[PDB]
Amino acid sequence: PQVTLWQRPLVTIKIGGQLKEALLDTGADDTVLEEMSLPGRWKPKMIGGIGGFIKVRQYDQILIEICGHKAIGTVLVGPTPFNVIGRNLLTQIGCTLNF
Amino acid sequence: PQVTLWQRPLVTIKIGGQLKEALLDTGADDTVLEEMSLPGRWKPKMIGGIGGFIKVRQYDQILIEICGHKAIGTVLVGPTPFNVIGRNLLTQIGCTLNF
Numbered sequence: 001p002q003v004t005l006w007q008r009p010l011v012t013i014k015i016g017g018q019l020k021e022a023l024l025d026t027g028a029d030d031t032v033l034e035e036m037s038l039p040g041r042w043k044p045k046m047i048g049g050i051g052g053f054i055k056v057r058q059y060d061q062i063l064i065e066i067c068g069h070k071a072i073g074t075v076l077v078g079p080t081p082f083n084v085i086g087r088n089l090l091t092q093i094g095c096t097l098n099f
Numbered sequence: 100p101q102v103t104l105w106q107r108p109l110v111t112i113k114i115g116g117q118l119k120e121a122l123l124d125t126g127a128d129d130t131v132l133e134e135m136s137l138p139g140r141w142k143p144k145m146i147g148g149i150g151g152f153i154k155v156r157q158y159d160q161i162l163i164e165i166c167g168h169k170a171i172g173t174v175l176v177g178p179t180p181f182n183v184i185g186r187n188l189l190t191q192i193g194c195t196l197n198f
């Protein structure tokens with residue numbers, strides 16, 4: 001659908017059997033989610049934002065359903081203030097910007 | 100134009116007589132630019148991001164031209180790693196997300 005930006009572009013995701021809301025974030029290269037229960041092995045990673053750097057657990061091959069749309073990719077789980085869907089997944093659900 | 104998200108959505112802006120490149124960022128509420136010479140009066144502000152919070156100077160009613168589109172708005176200048184156009188200006192140039 002089309003989303004204007006007068007509000008935050010929030011969507012529902014289902015991940016790991018849990019329902020969450022997340023921002024569709026075109027500035028973010030990677031998807032990063034607040035700390036939560038995911039099955040599996042992960043590897044530590046460090047990522048940067050405004051404010052500085054944080055350490056996150058990287059999970060690969062995770063299935064996310066964003067709106068109805070399923071995608072599989074790497075997810076980083078970490079101390080973010082908000083769940084953000086980044087370009088790695090936005091690409092898979094066919095998201096574009098238009099102006 | 101429509102922009103797909105396989106690469107960072109960068110655009111040229113002109114602000115304060117100077118030409119810069121900036122990311123179109125649907126997840127950012129506010130616009131935040133690296134340190135630069137703006138004239139005028141400003142206010143301290145702190146904003147948060149992934150990584151922590153930073154202190155910035157807020158300038159109001161500044162003209163930006165982003166592509167050939169003029170907008171006036173608040174801009175925050177400070178130590179971001181990259182210039183970010185946030186939704187406060189994205190709404191003025193008519194930007195939309197579509198999937």
Ligand SMILES: O=C(Nc1nc2ccccc2[nH]1)c1cccc(CN2C(=O)N(Cc3cccc(C(=O)Nc4nc5ccccc5[nH]4)c3)[C@H](Cc3ccccc3)[C@H](O)[C@@H](O)[C@H]2Cc2ccccc2)c1
Pocket residue numbers: 025026027028029030031032046047048049050051080081082084086124125126127128129130131145146147148149150179180181183185
């Ligand atoms: O993959 C990422 N990295 C990365 N991959 C890697 C791979 C390998 C190694 C290292 C790596 N590193 C990555 C993923 C997600 C987010 C970010 C960092 N990231 C933000 O940090 N941000 C804060 C941001 C940016 C601009 C403006 C604001 C804003 O207005 N805030 C605000 N607070 C306030 C308090 C009071 C009053 C007014 C206020 N206003 C906020 C928001 C996301 C966000 C939104 C809400 C809450 C938390 C985070 C932007 O949307 C994002 O695109 C982006 C912007 C940005 C992009 C690059 C550099 C710096 C910044 C990076």
